[PDB]
Design a protein around this nucleic acid. Structure first.
Ligand SMILES: [Ca+2]
Ligand SMILES: [Ca+2]
Lengths: 152, 152
DNA sequence: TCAAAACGTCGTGAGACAGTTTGG
DNA sequence: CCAAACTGTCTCACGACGTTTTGA
C-alpha cells in the first residue's frame, strides 16, 4: 500500500485538475447478475509526443498503464484497490475534481454491497449519474435509468 | 515583489502544465521603431462555468485579470514585472513548460537592451522562435525571419 | 514609441464516454 | 459472474496564436 511524497501529490493534483479525468460508467453486459458492469477509471490524457510524461506517471504511481489511440495517449488506472489508495491521497489537494474523487471513493466502498440488492445497485448507479453531471459529459448513453428499466 | 506559497506554486505548476500556456509573440505594428512589438503572455484557460477558479488565481497571484471569449475564459498575465517575479518562482516546479518559462525570463531581462540594437532585438526574436517551437504551435505567422526582412 | 489591454479564431489535444473481449 | 483490459469515438475545452486600439 504505497505512500506518495506530498510535493508529487500537489503537482499531480494540479495536472489532474487540468488534463485528467475521473470517470464512472455503467456498462451493459449480459454476463453480469444485474446485466451491467460498474467501471471506475482515473485517467490522464496527453499528446503521444509527450507519452514520456505518462510513462513517468506509471513509474511514479507504481501501478496503471499507458495506452495509445493515435495522436494522443492515456495513463489508465482502473484496478479498484490501487485506485482507492491513490485517490485517497490525491483527493485533499484537488480543486476541480474533488467531488468526483469522493463519489468514486465511496462507490468503491459499497461495491461489495451493491451486487446483493438490485435496489442497492440502482442506488450506486445514481452516484455515477452524479459524477457524470460534475464532469463535462456529452456522449453518455447508459445511465441508472436505462438500468432501472432493465431491472424491471 | 510578492513571495508565493510553495504548496500553491506546486499545485499551480501542475495546472499550468495542463490547461495553461506560456506565449511569446512578435506583433507587426507600424508605430514601433523595429515595426513590431514583443509581447509576452502567461495564461490559463477554462470554460466559463468554471470562471470562479480563474478569479481565485487573480486574488492568489495578486495581479492579472480574467477575460471572456464566449464559452471559455482565460486568466491573463502580461505585465512584464509581475510576470518576471511570478515565473521565477513557478519555473522550478514546471515539467512540460519549464523551458518556455526560462526563455520568457531571458527575454524579459534582455528587453531593455533589445530595443536599442537591431541585432539584439533579433537575438530576442530568435528566443521567441524557440518558445513557439516548444509549444503546440499551429497558427503562427510572424517569426524572427519576418523581422529580418524588415530590418532591411 | 511604447506596455498593455482589447478583440477574435484556427486546429487540435484533450476529457469522457462507448462497446467488446479476456481470463480467473 | 466478476475485475480488468482492450479497442473506438463524440464533441468540445483548450492552447496558442492573430490583429487592432488604448493611453501613457
Ligand atoms: Ca482542462
Ligand atoms: Ca494540456
Amino acid at each position: 500500500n504505497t505512500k506518495y511524497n506530498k510535493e508529487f501529490l500537489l503537482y499531480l493534483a494540479g495536472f489532474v485538475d487540468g488534463d485528467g479525468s475521473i470517470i464512472a460508467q455503467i456498462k451493459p453486459n449480459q454476463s453480469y447478475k444485474f446485466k451491467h458492469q460498474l467501471s471506475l477509471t482515473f485517467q490522464v490524457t496527453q499528446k503521444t509526443q509527450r507519452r514520456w510524461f505518462l510513462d513517468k506517471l506509471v513509474d511514479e504511481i507504481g501501478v496503471g498503464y499507458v495506452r495509445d489511440r493515435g495522436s494522443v495517449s492515456d495513463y489508465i488506472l482502473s484496478e479498484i484497490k490501487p485506485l482507492h489508495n491513490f485517490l485517497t491521497q490525491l483527493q485533499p489537494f484537488l480543486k476541480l475534481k474533488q467531488k468526483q474523487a469522493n463519489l468514486v471513493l465511496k462507490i468503491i466502498e459499497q461495491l461489495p454491497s451493491a451486487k446483493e440488492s438490485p435496489d442497492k445497485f440502482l442506488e450506486v448507479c445514481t452516484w455515477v449519474d452524479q459524477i457524470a453531471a460534475l464532469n463535462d459529459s456529452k456522449t453518455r448513453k447508459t445511465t441508472s435509468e436505462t438500468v432501472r428499466a432493465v431491472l424491471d
